[PDB]
Amino acid sequence: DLQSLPTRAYLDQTVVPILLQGLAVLAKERPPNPIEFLASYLLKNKAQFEDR
Amino acid sequence: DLQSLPTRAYLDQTVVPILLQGLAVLAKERPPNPIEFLASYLLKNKAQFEDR
Amino acid sequence: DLQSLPTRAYLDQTVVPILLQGLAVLAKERPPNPIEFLASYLLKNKAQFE
Amino acid sequence: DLQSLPTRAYLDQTVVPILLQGLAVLAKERPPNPIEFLASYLLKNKAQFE
Amino acid sequence: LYKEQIAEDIVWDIIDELEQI
Contacts of B21 in chain E (CB under 8 A): 8, 12
Tell me how many domains chain B contains. 1
Do residues A37 and B10 make contact, with C-beta atoms less than 8 angstroms apart?
Answer: no
Q: Which residue on chain E is closest to B25 by alpha carbon? A: E9
> b/e per residue, B1-26, with b = 16+ CB within 10 A?
eeeebeeebbbbbbbbbbbbbbbbeb
- Say which DSSP state D13 is in: T
The CATH code of the domain that includes B15 is: 1.20.890.10
Record the resolution, in angstroms.
2.0
How far does CA E14 lie from the centroid of its chain? 5
For B26, the domain range is: 1-52
Asked if E18 and D7 come within 8 Å (Cβ–Cβ), the reply is no
In sign, the C-alpha dihedral spanning C11, C12, C16, C20 is: positive
3-class DSSP string for chain E: CCHHHHHHHHHHHHHHHHHHC
Do residues B9 and C48 make contact, with C-beta atoms less than 8 angstroms apart?
Answer: yes
CA-to-CA distance for B31 and A39, rounded, in angstroms? 17
Q: Which residues contact D38 (CB under 8 A, 6 or more apart)?
A: C15, C19, C42, D22, D23, D26
- Nearest-CA neighbor of A23 among C14, B38, B14? B14
CA-to-CA distance for C19 and B23, rounded, in angstroms? 18
For chain A, the chains sharing at least 3 beta-carbon pairs closer than 8 angstroms are: B
